[PDB]
Amino acid sequence: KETAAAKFERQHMDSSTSAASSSNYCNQMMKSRNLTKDRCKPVNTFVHESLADVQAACSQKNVACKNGQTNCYQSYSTMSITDCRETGSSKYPNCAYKTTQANKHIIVACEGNPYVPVHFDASV
Ligand SMILES: [Cl-]
Ligand SMILES: [Cl-]
Ligand SMILES: [Cl-]
Ligand SMILES: [Cl-]
């Protein structure tokens, strides 16, 4: 099985581009990261920063997660992110995504040793 930290990396990291290329960024990335394999993941955010900077958020501002857990952290600085969400025309096996690029703080849940990101909670 995939570890929690590795699943977070695969689903949420894109350190190779500074920001979403075109409107087709999400269709390509959701496919590349295997998030459209058996079904279309409905919503998924990619962060365009180094893995180190995203991991460093786990020692930044401790805040509540939406589900009430207390292991969430909000990055002190804004980061380049792209939110990918299915459009109305999306239907497996023909997934289709809207690409929205933004610069916002990220909120992640962290766990383990090393204490690293295991869930992407929200962007602010
Ligand atoms: Cl790992
Ligand atoms: Cl590259
Ligand atoms: Cl997400
Ligand atoms: Cl941006």
Tab-separated table of N, CA, C and O and ligand atoms in Angstrom:
chain	number	residue	atom	x	y	z
A	1	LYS	N	0.874	-1.216	0.000
A	1	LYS	CA	0.000	0.000	0.000
A	1	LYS	C	0.889	1.237	0.000
A	1	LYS	O	2.022	1.179	0.464
A	2	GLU	N	0.367	2.352	-0.511
A	2	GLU	CA	1.132	3.599	-0.557
A	2	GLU	C	1.150	4.199	0.843
A	2	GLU	O	0.126	4.186	1.528
A	3	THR	N	2.286	4.728	1.294
A	3	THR	CA	2.294	5.348	2.594
A	3	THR	C	1.501	6.675	2.512
A	3	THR	O	1.285	7.215	1.426
A	4	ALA	N	1.117	7.201	3.669
A	4	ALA	CA	0.319	8.424	3.670
A	4	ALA	C	1.118	9.601	3.109
A	4	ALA	O	0.586	10.448	2.378
A	5	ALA	N	2.386	9.663	3.470
A	5	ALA	CA	3.249	10.772	3.023
A	5	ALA	C	3.480	10.691	1.520
A	5	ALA	O	3.503	11.706	0.842
A	6	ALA	N	3.685	9.488	1.007
A	6	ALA	CA	3.909	9.365	-0.429
A	6	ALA	C	2.611	9.677	-1.198
A	6	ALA	O	2.669	10.227	-2.291
A	7	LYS	N	1.456	9.297	-0.646
A	7	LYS	CA	0.203	9.604	-1.330
A	7	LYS	C	0.036	11.144	-1.406
A	7	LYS	O	-0.447	11.708	-2.414
A	8	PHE	N	0.394	11.823	-0.322
A	8	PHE	CA	0.304	13.299	-0.340
A	8	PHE	C	1.216	13.860	-1.406
A	8	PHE	O	0.829	14.781	-2.144
A	9	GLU	N	2.437	13.323	-1.524
A	9	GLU	CA	3.345	13.832	-2.550
A	9	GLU	C	2.781	13.648	-3.958
A	9	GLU	O	2.774	14.577	-4.788
A	10	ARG	N	2.344	12.438	-4.244
A	10	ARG	CA	1.796	12.169	-5.557
A	10	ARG	C	0.554	13.019	-5.863
A	10	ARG	O	0.367	13.520	-6.990
A	11	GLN	N	-0.308	13.180	-4.873
A	11	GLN	CA	-1.529	13.941	-5.172
A	11	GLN	C	-1.362	15.443	-5.182
A	11	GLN	O	-2.087	16.139	-5.921
A	12	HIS	N	-0.462	15.944	-4.343
A	12	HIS	CA	-0.381	17.392	-4.175
A	12	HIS	C	0.847	18.177	-4.522
A	12	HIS	O	0.810	19.402	-4.465
A	13	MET	N	1.943	17.512	-4.880
A	13	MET	CA	3.149	18.268	-5.220
A	13	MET	C	3.417	18.437	-6.705
A	13	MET	O	3.326	17.465	-7.449
A	14	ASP	N	3.729	19.655	-7.125
A	14	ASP	CA	4.187	19.876	-8.506
A	14	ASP	C	5.241	20.940	-8.483
A	14	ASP	O	5.011	22.118	-8.776
A	15	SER	N	6.432	20.507	-8.109
A	15	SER	CA	7.587	21.366	-7.956
A	15	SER	C	8.298	21.637	-9.284
A	15	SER	O	9.328	22.311	-9.292
A	16	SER	N	7.770	21.113	-10.386
A	16	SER	CA	8.453	21.265	-11.684
A	16	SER	C	7.993	22.452	-12.501
A	16	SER	O	8.627	22.809	-13.508
A	17	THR	N	6.890	23.070	-12.091
A	17	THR	CA	6.387	24.254	-12.801
A	17	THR	C	6.096	25.317	-11.752
A	17	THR	O	5.738	24.980	-10.626
A	18	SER	N	6.232	26.596	-12.107
A	18	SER	CA	5.978	27.646	-11.137
A	18	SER	C	4.490	27.921	-11.010
A	18	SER	O	4.046	28.509	-10.039
A	19	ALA	N	3.713	27.471	-11.982
A	19	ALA	CA	2.276	27.718	-11.965
A	19	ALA	C	1.671	26.926	-13.101
A	19	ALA	O	2.381	26.541	-14.035
A	20	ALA	N	0.355	26.740	-13.040
A	20	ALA	CA	-0.382	25.989	-14.038
A	20	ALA	C	-0.109	26.566	-15.389
A	20	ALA	O	-0.222	27.775	-15.601
A	21	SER	N	0.257	25.675	-16.301
A	21	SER	CA	0.534	26.066	-17.646
A	21	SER	C	-0.754	26.705	-18.184
A	21	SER	O	-1.102	27.826	-17.835
A	22	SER	N	-1.487	25.963	-18.980
A	22	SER	CA	-2.698	26.443	-19.604
A	22	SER	C	-3.924	25.912	-18.884
A	22	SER	O	-3.835	25.321	-17.808
A	23	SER	N	-5.071	26.083	-19.538
A	23	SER	CA	-6.343	25.581	-19.049
A	23	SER	C	-6.341	24.052	-19.034
A	23	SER	O	-7.164	23.442	-18.360
A	24	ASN	N	-5.391	23.444	-19.737
A	24	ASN	CA	-5.347	22.001	-19.807
A	24	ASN	C	-4.442	21.364	-18.739
A	24	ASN	O	-4.352	20.137	-18.672
A	25	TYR	N	-3.810	22.194	-17.922
A	25	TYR	CA	-2.928	21.702	-16.861
A	25	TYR	C	-3.591	20.611	-16.031
A	25	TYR	O	-3.029	19.528	-15.871
A	26	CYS	N	-4.801	20.855	-15.516
A	26	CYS	CA	-5.436	19.848	-14.672
A	26	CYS	C	-5.757	18.548	-15.378
A	26	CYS	O	-5.535	17.465	-14.826
A	27	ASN	N	-6.309	18.603	-16.586
A	27	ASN	CA	-6.560	17.337	-17.270
A	27	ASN	C	-5.273	16.513	-17.363
A	27	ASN	O	-5.297	15.315	-17.136
A	28	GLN	N	-4.164	17.161	-17.687
A	28	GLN	CA	-2.905	16.427	-17.849
A	28	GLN	C	-2.369	15.898	-16.550
A	28	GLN	O	-1.938	14.738	-16.467
A	29	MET	N	-2.364	16.763	-15.538
A	29	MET	CA	-1.826	16.345	-14.223
A	29	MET	C	-2.695	15.348	-13.495
A	29	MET	O	-2.191	14.442	-12.805
A	30	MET	N	-4.015	15.486	-13.598
A	30	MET	CA	-4.857	14.522	-12.907
A	30	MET	C	-4.653	13.139	-13.521
A	30	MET	O	-4.760	12.112	-12.826
A	31	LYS	N	-4.335	13.106	-14.812
A	31	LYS	CA	-4.119	11.807	-15.474
A	31	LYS	C	-2.730	11.247	-15.132
A	31	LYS	O	-2.614	10.081	-14.754
A	32	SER	N	-1.704	12.090	-15.237
A	32	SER	CA	-0.285	11.797	-14.960
A	32	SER	C	-0.114	11.265	-13.544
A	32	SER	O	0.638	10.319	-13.303
A	33	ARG	N	-0.797	11.889	-12.588
A	33	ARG	CA	-0.694	11.427	-11.195
A	33	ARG	C	-1.646	10.283	-10.815
A	33	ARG	O	-1.828	9.977	-9.634
A	34	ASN	N	-2.280	9.660	-11.810
A	34	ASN	CA	-3.172	8.539	-11.606
A	34	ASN	C	-4.373	8.825	-10.717
A	34	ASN	O	-4.817	7.993	-9.929
A	35	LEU	N	-4.907	10.041	-10.854
A	35	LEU	CA	-6.060	10.422	-10.077
A	35	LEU	C	-7.331	10.272	-10.919
A	35	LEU	O	-8.380	10.724	-10.490
A	36	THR	N	-7.222	9.661	-12.112
A	36	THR	CA	-8.405	9.427	-12.956
A	36	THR	C	-8.459	7.966	-13.393
A	36	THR	O	-9.181	7.622	-14.328
A	37	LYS	N	-7.688	7.122	-12.709
A	37	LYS	CA	-7.593	5.680	-13.028
A	37	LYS	C	-8.893	4.897	-13.104
A	37	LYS	O	-9.255	4.348	-14.158
A	38	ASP	N	-9.584	4.805	-11.979
A	38	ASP	CA	-10.831	4.061	-11.947
A	38	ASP	C	-12.029	4.971	-11.857
A	38	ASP	O	-13.139	4.561	-12.167
A	39	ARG	N	-11.802	6.209	-11.415
A	39	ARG	CA	-12.859	7.206	-11.283
A	39	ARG	C	-12.185	8.562	-11.375
A	39	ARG	O	-10.955	8.644	-11.343
A	40	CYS	N	-12.973	9.621	-11.545
A	40	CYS	CA	-12.375	10.954	-11.596
A	40	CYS	C	-12.356	11.511	-10.176
A	40	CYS	O	-13.411	11.634	-9.542
A	41	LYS	N	-11.178	11.825	-9.640
A	41	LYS	CA	-11.131	12.410	-8.302
A	41	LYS	C	-11.836	13.752	-8.536
A	41	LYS	O	-11.472	14.491	-9.452
A	42	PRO	N	-12.790	14.099	-7.689
A	42	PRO	CA	-13.495	15.369	-7.966
A	42	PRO	C	-12.773	16.685	-7.835
A	42	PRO	O	-12.915	17.588	-8.692
A	43	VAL	N	-11.974	16.778	-6.787
A	43	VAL	CA	-11.261	18.016	-6.468
A	43	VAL	C	-9.852	17.648	-6.045
A	43	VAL	O	-9.648	16.696	-5.295
A	44	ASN	N	-8.880	18.401	-6.511
A	44	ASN	CA	-7.511	18.123	-6.086
A	44	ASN	C	-6.638	19.352	-6.277
A	44	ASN	O	-6.649	19.941	-7.340
A	45	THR	N	-5.863	19.734	-5.258
A	45	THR	CA	-4.986	20.886	-5.371
A	45	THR	C	-3.517	20.485	-5.525
A	45	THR	O	-3.028	19.611	-4.774
A	46	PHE	N	-2.828	21.102	-6.489
A	46	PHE	CA	-1.380	20.890	-6.667
A	46	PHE	C	-0.640	22.128	-6.151
A	46	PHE	O	-1.081	23.261	-6.354
A	47	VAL	N	0.466	21.909	-5.451
A	47	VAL	CA	1.253	23.039	-4.915
A	47	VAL	C	2.565	23.163	-5.692
A	47	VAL	O	3.293	22.208	-5.813
A	48	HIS	N	2.824	24.348	-6.233
A	48	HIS	CA	4.004	24.617	-7.064
A	48	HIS	C	5.106	25.235	-6.238
A	48	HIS	O	5.402	26.453	-6.376
A	49	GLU	N	5.612	24.466	-5.299
A	49	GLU	CA	6.735	24.905	-4.466
A	49	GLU	C	7.573	23.658	-4.249
A	49	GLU	O	7.180	22.551	-4.609
A	50	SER	N	8.730	23.828	-3.641
A	50	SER	CA	9.568	22.692	-3.392
A	50	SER	C	8.941	21.806	-2.336
A	50	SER	O	8.184	22.279	-1.465
A	51	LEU	N	9.276	20.508	-2.392
A	51	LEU	CA	8.798	19.584	-1.388
A	51	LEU	C	9.253	20.093	-0.019
A	51	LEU	O	8.502	20.049	0.964
A	52	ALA	N	10.485	20.582	0.066
A	52	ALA	CA	10.938	21.092	1.360
A	52	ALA	C	10.087	22.223	1.942
A	52	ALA	O	9.815	22.254	3.145
A	53	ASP	N	9.672	23.153	1.083
A	53	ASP	CA	8.868	24.260	1.576
A	53	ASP	C	7.505	23.772	2.026
A	53	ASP	O	6.930	24.337	2.970
A	54	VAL	N	6.961	22.736	1.363
A	54	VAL	CA	5.628	22.241	1.745
A	54	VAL	C	5.761	21.446	3.040
A	54	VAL	O	4.950	21.543	3.944
A	55	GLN	N	6.820	20.655	3.141
A	55	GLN	CA	7.009	19.928	4.385
A	55	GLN	C	7.211	20.879	5.558
A	55	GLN	O	6.790	20.584	6.687
A	56	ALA	N	7.895	22.002	5.312
A	56	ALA	CA	8.191	22.962	6.371
A	56	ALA	C	6.892	23.540	6.968
A	56	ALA	O	6.886	24.021	8.090
A	57	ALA	N	5.785	23.467	6.227
A	57	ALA	CA	4.546	23.975	6.790
A	57	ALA	C	4.133	23.235	8.080
A	57	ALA	O	3.420	23.793	8.934
A	58	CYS	N	4.574	21.988	8.239
A	58	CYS	CA	4.241	21.210	9.437
A	58	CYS	C	4.828	21.755	10.727
A	58	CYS	O	4.509	21.257	11.806
A	59	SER	N	5.714	22.754	10.621
A	59	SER	CA	6.245	23.393	11.836
A	59	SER	C	5.915	24.891	11.848
A	59	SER	O	6.537	25.690	12.561
A	60	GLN	N	4.904	25.248	11.060
A	60	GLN	CA	4.444	26.630	10.978
A	60	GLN	C	3.198	26.863	11.851
A	60	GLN	O	3.216	26.394	12.999
A	61	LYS	N	2.142	27.530	11.351
A	61	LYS	CA	1.008	27.893	12.260
A	61	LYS	C	0.044	26.764	12.512
A	61	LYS	O	-0.633	26.332	11.580
A	62	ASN	N	-0.054	26.316	13.770
A	62	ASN	CA	-0.965	25.217	14.090
A	62	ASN	C	-2.390	25.768	14.107
A	62	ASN	O	-2.680	26.740	14.829
A	63	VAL	N	-3.261	25.156	13.292
A	63	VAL	CA	-4.675	25.569	13.201
A	63	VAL	C	-5.581	24.348	13.148
A	63	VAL	O	-5.136	23.245	12.867
A	64	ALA	N	-6.870	24.540	13.421
A	64	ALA	CA	-7.753	23.406	13.338
A	64	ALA	C	-7.977	23.013	11.886
A	64	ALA	O	-7.962	23.862	10.976
A	65	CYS	N	-8.172	21.714	11.684
A	65	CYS	CA	-8.535	21.168	10.389
A	65	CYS	C	-10.059	21.293	10.334
A	65	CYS	O	-10.696	21.428	11.387
A	66	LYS	N	-10.646	21.236	9.132
A	66	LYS	CA	-12.111	21.338	9.009
A	66	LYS	C	-12.871	20.278	9.785
A	66	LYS	O	-13.974	20.547	10.287
A	67	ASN	N	-12.281	19.087	9.870
A	67	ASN	CA	-12.900	17.966	10.562
A	67	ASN	C	-12.699	18.031	12.069
A	67	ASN	O	-13.107	17.122	12.802
A	68	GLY	N	-12.067	19.106	12.537
A	68	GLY	CA	-11.880	19.291	13.957
A	68	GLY	C	-10.591	18.779	14.564
A	68	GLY	O	-10.312	19.037	15.737
A	69	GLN	N	-9.807	18.045	13.779
A	69	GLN	CA	-8.535	17.544	14.273
A	69	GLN	C	-7.612	18.737	14.489
A	69	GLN	O	-7.817	19.798	13.896
A	70	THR	N	-6.597	18.552	15.319
A	70	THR	CA	-5.687	19.626	15.666
A	70	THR	C	-4.274	19.478	15.128
A	70	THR	O	-3.345	20.089	15.656
A	71	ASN	N	-4.109	18.656	14.093
A	71	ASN	CA	-2.784	18.476	13.498
A	71	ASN	C	-2.676	19.178	12.149
A	71	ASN	O	-1.968	18.712	11.293
A	72	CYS	N	-3.375	20.304	11.973
A	72	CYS	CA	-3.295	21.044	10.734
A	72	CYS	C	-2.378	22.241	10.942
A	72	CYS	O	-2.245	22.769	12.049
A	73	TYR	N	-1.729	22.625	9.854
A	73	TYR	CA	-0.820	23.750	9.868
A	73	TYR	C	-1.052	24.611	8.641
A	73	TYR	O	-1.225	24.099	7.544
A	74	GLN	N	-1.026	25.922	8.839
A	74	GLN	CA	-1.210	26.893	7.760
A	74	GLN	C	0.144	27.524	7.463
A	74	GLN	O	0.792	28.085	8.350
A	75	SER	N	0.595	27.401	6.221
A	75	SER	CA	1.867	28.021	5.862
A	75	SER	C	1.861	29.515	6.165
A	75	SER	O	0.871	30.229	5.933
A	76	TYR	N	2.982	30.021	6.683
A	76	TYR	CA	3.042	31.428	6.983
A	76	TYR	C	2.976	32.276	5.697
A	76	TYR	O	2.499	33.411	5.694
A	77	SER	N	3.521	31.754	4.605
A	77	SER	CA	3.499	32.549	3.379
A	77	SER	C	2.533	31.962	2.381
A	77	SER	O	2.130	30.813	2.500
A	78	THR	N	2.160	32.774	1.402
A	78	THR	CA	1.341	32.230	0.328
A	78	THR	C	2.252	31.389	-0.605
A	78	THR	O	3.492	31.576	-0.668
A	79	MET	N	1.628	30.444	-1.318
A	79	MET	CA	2.327	29.569	-2.224
A	79	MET	C	1.568	29.521	-3.541
A	79	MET	O	0.343	29.738	-3.589
A	80	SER	N	2.272	29.197	-4.611
A	80	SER	CA	1.600	29.046	-5.905
A	80	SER	C	0.885	27.706	-5.909
A	80	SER	O	1.486	26.667	-5.624
A	81	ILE	N	-0.429	27.704	-6.194
A	81	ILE	CA	-1.198	26.442	-6.197
A	81	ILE	C	-2.124	26.414	-7.404
A	81	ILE	O	-2.374	27.442	-8.018
A	82	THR	N	-2.561	25.222	-7.768
A	82	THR	CA	-3.559	25.120	-8.815
A	82	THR	C	-4.660	24.220	-8.289
A	82	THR	O	-4.390	23.068	-7.874
A	83	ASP	N	-5.914	24.708	-8.280
A	83	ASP	CA	-7.019	23.861	-7.856
A	83	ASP	C	-7.581	23.217	-9.113
A	83	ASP	O	-7.728	23.879	-10.138
A	84	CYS	N	-7.819	21.902	-9.069
A	84	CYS	CA	-8.383	21.158	-10.209
A	84	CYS	C	-9.711	20.584	-9.742
A	84	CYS	O	-9.774	19.912	-8.723
A	85	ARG	N	-10.784	20.886	-10.472
A	85	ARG	CA	-12.114	20.410	-10.112
A	85	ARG	C	-12.860	19.960	-11.350
A	85	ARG	O	-12.759	20.568	-12.433
A	86	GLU	N	-13.575	18.855	-11.215
A	86	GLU	CA	-14.333	18.384	-12.375
A	86	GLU	C	-15.384	19.417	-12.823
A	86	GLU	O	-16.033	20.089	-12.007
A	87	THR	N	-15.569	19.490	-14.132
A	87	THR	CA	-16.561	20.378	-14.746
A	87	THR	C	-17.825	19.551	-14.934
A	87	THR	O	-17.820	18.334	-14.702
A	88	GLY	N	-18.904	20.210	-15.355
A	88	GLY	CA	-20.157	19.508	-15.566
A	88	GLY	C	-20.058	18.449	-16.648
A	88	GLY	O	-20.736	17.436	-16.567
A	89	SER	N	-19.216	18.671	-17.656
A	89	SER	CA	-19.073	17.711	-18.749
A	89	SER	C	-18.188	16.517	-18.409
A	89	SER	O	-18.008	15.604	-19.223
A	90	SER	N	-17.643	16.506	-17.201
A	90	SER	CA	-16.767	15.409	-16.836
A	90	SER	C	-17.536	14.134	-16.533
A	90	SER	O	-18.491	14.136	-15.779
A	91	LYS	N	-17.092	13.032	-17.114
A	91	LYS	CA	-17.737	11.753	-16.853
A	91	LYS	C	-16.774	10.621	-17.210
A	91	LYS	O	-16.362	10.484	-18.363
A	92	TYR	N	-16.399	9.833	-16.200
A	92	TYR	CA	-15.470	8.720	-16.377
A	92	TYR	C	-15.983	7.805	-17.485
A	92	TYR	O	-17.183	7.560	-17.575
A	93	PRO	N	-15.079	7.266	-18.319
A	93	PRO	CA	-13.626	7.444	-18.306
A	93	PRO	C	-13.151	8.703	-19.043
A	93	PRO	O	-12.004	8.790	-19.474
A	94	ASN	N	-14.039	9.680	-19.197
A	94	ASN	CA	-13.668	10.918	-19.870
A	94	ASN	C	-13.688	12.062	-18.847
A	94	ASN	O	-14.568	12.924	-18.865
A	95	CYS	N	-12.732	12.046	-17.924
A	95	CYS	CA	-12.694	13.104	-16.914
A	95	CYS	C	-12.336	14.432	-17.561
A	95	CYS	O	-11.622	14.493	-18.563
A	96	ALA	N	-12.823	15.512	-16.961
A	96	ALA	CA	-12.567	16.833	-17.484
A	96	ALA	C	-12.485	17.776	-16.298
A	96	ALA	O	-13.356	17.760	-15.433
A	97	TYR	N	-11.420	18.584	-16.286
A	97	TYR	CA	-11.168	19.506	-15.178
A	97	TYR	C	-11.005	20.961	-15.528
A	97	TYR	O	-10.463	21.299	-16.564
A	98	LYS	N	-11.474	21.809	-14.602
A	98	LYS	CA	-11.266	23.260	-14.672
A	98	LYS	C	-9.991	23.487	-13.861
A	98	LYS	O	-9.833	22.934	-12.761
A	99	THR	N	-9.116	24.308	-14.411
A	99	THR	CA	-7.832	24.661	-13.807
A	99	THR	C	-7.886	26.062	-13.242
A	99	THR	O	-8.064	27.004	-13.994
A	100	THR	N	-7.718	26.227	-11.917
A	100	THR	CA	-7.700	27.584	-11.366
A	100	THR	C	-6.379	27.820	-10.587
A	100	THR	O	-6.165	27.238	-9.540
A	101	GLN	N	-5.534	28.706	-11.105
A	101	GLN	CA	-4.231	29.017	-10.487
A	101	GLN	C	-4.407	30.130	-9.473
A	101	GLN	O	-5.186	31.074	-9.696
A	102	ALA	N	-3.739	30.034	-8.325
A	102	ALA	CA	-3.882	31.091	-7.327
A	102	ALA	C	-2.646	31.078	-6.465
A	102	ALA	O	-1.832	30.145	-6.571
A	103	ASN	N	-2.507	32.105	-5.622
A	103	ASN	CA	-1.383	32.182	-4.689
A	103	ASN	C	-2.059	32.303	-3.334
A	103	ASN	O	-2.678	33.320	-3.021
A	104	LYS	N	-1.961	31.268	-2.521
A	104	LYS	CA	-2.641	31.296	-1.269
A	104	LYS	C	-1.871	30.544	-0.228
A	104	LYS	O	-0.948	29.813	-0.547
A	105	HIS	N	-2.260	30.713	1.034
A	105	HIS	CA	-1.643	29.920	2.068
A	105	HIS	C	-2.207	28.528	1.959
A	105	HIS	O	-3.371	28.347	1.551
A	106	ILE	N	-1.389	27.541	2.299
A	106	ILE	CA	-1.873	26.181	2.273
A	106	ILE	C	-2.091	25.700	3.696
A	106	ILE	O	-1.419	26.160	4.638
A	107	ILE	N	-3.062	24.803	3.868
A	107	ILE	CA	-3.314	24.200	5.178
A	107	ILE	C	-3.208	22.705	4.998
A	107	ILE	O	-3.931	22.138	4.183
A	108	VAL	N	-2.271	22.075	5.712
A	108	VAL	CA	-2.093	20.621	5.622
A	108	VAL	C	-2.156	19.933	6.967
A	108	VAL	O	-1.848	20.540	7.984
A	109	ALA	N	-2.599	18.682	6.981
A	109	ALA	CA	-2.568	17.905	8.219
A	109	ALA	C	-1.240	17.165	8.154
A	109	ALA	O	-0.826	16.658	7.084
A	110	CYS	N	-0.580	17.118	9.284
A	110	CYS	CA	0.718	16.465	9.362
A	110	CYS	C	0.716	15.319	10.361
A	110	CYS	O	0.017	15.338	11.371
A	111	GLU	N	1.509	14.306	10.061
A	111	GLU	CA	1.632	13.176	10.971
A	111	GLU	C	2.904	12.414	10.743
A	111	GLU	O	3.559	12.558	9.704
A	112	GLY	N	3.273	11.643	11.760
A	112	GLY	CA	4.452	10.787	11.689
A	112	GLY	C	5.785	11.323	12.149
A	112	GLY	O	5.922	12.428	12.693
A	113	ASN	N	6.796	10.489	11.928
A	113	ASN	CA	8.171	10.830	12.246
A	113	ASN	C	8.997	10.328	11.064
A	113	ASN	O	9.146	9.134	10.900
A	114	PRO	N	9.536	11.235	10.218
A	114	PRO	CA	9.411	12.695	10.314
A	114	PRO	C	7.957	13.140	10.205
A	114	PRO	O	7.111	12.429	9.656
A	115	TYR	N	7.685	14.307	10.772
A	115	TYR	CA	6.321	14.888	10.823
A	115	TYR	C	6.145	15.640	9.494
A	115	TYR	O	6.673	16.727	9.321
A	116	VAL	N	5.392	15.033	8.560
A	116	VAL	CA	5.227	15.548	7.221
A	116	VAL	C	3.748	15.595	6.824
A	116	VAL	O	2.903	15.040	7.509
A	117	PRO	N	3.429	16.257	5.705
A	117	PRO	CA	2.052	16.378	5.237
A	117	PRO	C	1.427	15.052	4.835
A	117	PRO	O	2.058	14.279	4.140
A	118	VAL	N	0.212	14.797	5.317
A	118	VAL	CA	-0.521	13.596	4.904
A	118	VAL	C	-1.883	13.955	4.314
A	118	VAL	O	-2.536	13.094	3.740
A	119	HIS	N	-2.345	15.201	4.460
A	119	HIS	CA	-3.631	15.554	3.850
A	119	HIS	C	-3.601	17.016	3.485
A	119	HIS	O	-2.946	17.811	4.168
A	120	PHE	N	-4.256	17.373	2.384
A	120	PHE	CA	-4.362	18.785	2.023
A	120	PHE	C	-5.778	19.205	2.495
A	120	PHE	O	-6.794	18.701	1.983
A	121	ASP	N	-5.846	20.119	3.470
A	121	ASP	CA	-7.159	20.533	4.009
A	121	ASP	C	-7.859	21.675	3.272
A	121	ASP	O	-9.062	21.590	2.986
A	122	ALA	N	-7.103	22.711	2.916
A	122	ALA	CA	-7.686	23.900	2.282
A	122	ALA	C	-6.580	24.846	1.911
A	122	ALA	O	-5.425	24.633	2.295
A	123	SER	N	-6.947	25.893	1.177
A	123	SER	CA	-5.992	26.936	0.877
A	123	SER	C	-6.757	28.167	1.391
A	123	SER	O	-8.002	28.190	1.433
A	124	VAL	N	-6.016	29.161	1.840
A	124	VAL	CA	-6.643	30.402	2.249
A	124	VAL	C	-5.901	31.512	1.482
A	124	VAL	O	-4.742	31.797	1.816
B	1	CL	CL	7.180	7.655	2.358
B	2	CL	CL	11.095	19.430	-15.406
B	3	CL	CL	-7.253	18.850	-2.492
B	4	CL	CL	-0.368	32.529	-9.169
